[PDB]
């Protein structure tokens, strides 16, 4: 997706302040997907919550 003789794009002045577009993110509704709703699309989903996961 990039031509030759083009140095690979320099992440400071090129896409640092560019916001990303949108992820895939299938929309979950409440009243059926109520438990998983707060955390289901999160990098590690339950990470800082001692009730459901080990720890960090």
């Amino acid at each position: 997706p990039f031509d030759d003789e083009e140095p690979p794009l320099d992440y400071a002045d090129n896409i640092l302040d560019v916001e990303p577009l949108e992820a895939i993110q299938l929309e979950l509704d409440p009243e059926e997907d109520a438990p998983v709703l707060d955390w289901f699309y999160d990098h590690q989903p339950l990470r800082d919550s001692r009730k459901y996961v080990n720890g960090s």
């Binding site: 400071a12 002045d13 640092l16 302040d17």
Partner: protein, 138 residues
């Protein structure tokens, strides 16, 4: 600018946002400018300097002044506008005018010691105007 928490952040973020926008613009200028003339490692002192002043602005704005609440303070840390680590070394007793975390790492140094930025100037020898080679000065 990337915010990475989709939060619509709490209050009062609107009164620190022009300040933090100014510090980010100065950090882009202190990140982008060339390295000719600036010798080898004095061209990387200013990013530690402005990182220090950004973390210190949120530091004395929260613990000292008690203007910002706890939630927005934890927000500014968890986004990236502060160190989680360097305020934890600012809270400890003997050192809260600290330069940055490289003068505490005792195995960055070859002799197993802390850098001469972290020496009480009153009890060093009188005239030597040494600047720390890592962090920038004392």
């Amino acid at each position: 600018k990337v915010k990475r928490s989709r939060k619509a952040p709490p209050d009062g973020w609107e009164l620190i946002e022009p300040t933090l926008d100014e510090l980010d613009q100065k950090m882009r200028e202190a990140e982008t400018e060339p390295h000719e003339g600036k010798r080898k490692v004095e061209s990387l002192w200013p990013i530690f300097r402005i990182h220090h002043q950004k973390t210190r602005y949120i530091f004395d704005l929260f613990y000292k002044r008690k203007a910002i609440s706890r939630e927005l303070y934890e927000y500014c840390i968890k986004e990236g506008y502060a160190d989680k680590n360097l305020i934890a070394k600012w809270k400890k007793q003997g050192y809260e005018n600290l330069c940055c975390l490289r003068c505490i790492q005792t195995r960055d140094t070859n002799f197993g010691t802390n850098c001469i930025c972290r020496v009480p100037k009153s009890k060093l020898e009188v005239g030597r105007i040494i600047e720390c080679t890592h962090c920038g000065c004392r």
